[PDB]
Amino acid sequence: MGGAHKVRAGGPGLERAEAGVPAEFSIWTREAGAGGLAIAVEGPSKAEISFEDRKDGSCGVAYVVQEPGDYEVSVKFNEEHIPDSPFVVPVASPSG
């Protein structure tokens, strides 16, 4: 218990997102090592969540929601929130 405390996560997808547009962030599991990463997005529409197992030792996550609103993005390592998880993420309607 508490492996997750050594795991860090950042990138634009844990800060802001646009509806229908993929939101990417990174998770660096160097210190905690290997384990089970469970990602949750909780909000007014269903997220599609993808992983990217990078050679750099980091893991990539991209998610897409379609409805603008306020989402919470959870990152658990071995079933336990990592620091600052849940992340509160505002998803806006796209521009352009």
């Binding site: 090592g33 290997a34 990463l37 469970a38 990602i39 949750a40 909000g43 007014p44 197992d53 893991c59």
Partner: peptide, 13 residues
């Protein structure tokens, strides 16, 4: 209404 979507992956060593 509120949807919660969970996906799991195993970050390798």
């Amino acid at each position: 209404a509120r949807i919660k979507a969970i996906n799991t992956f195993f970050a390798k060593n």
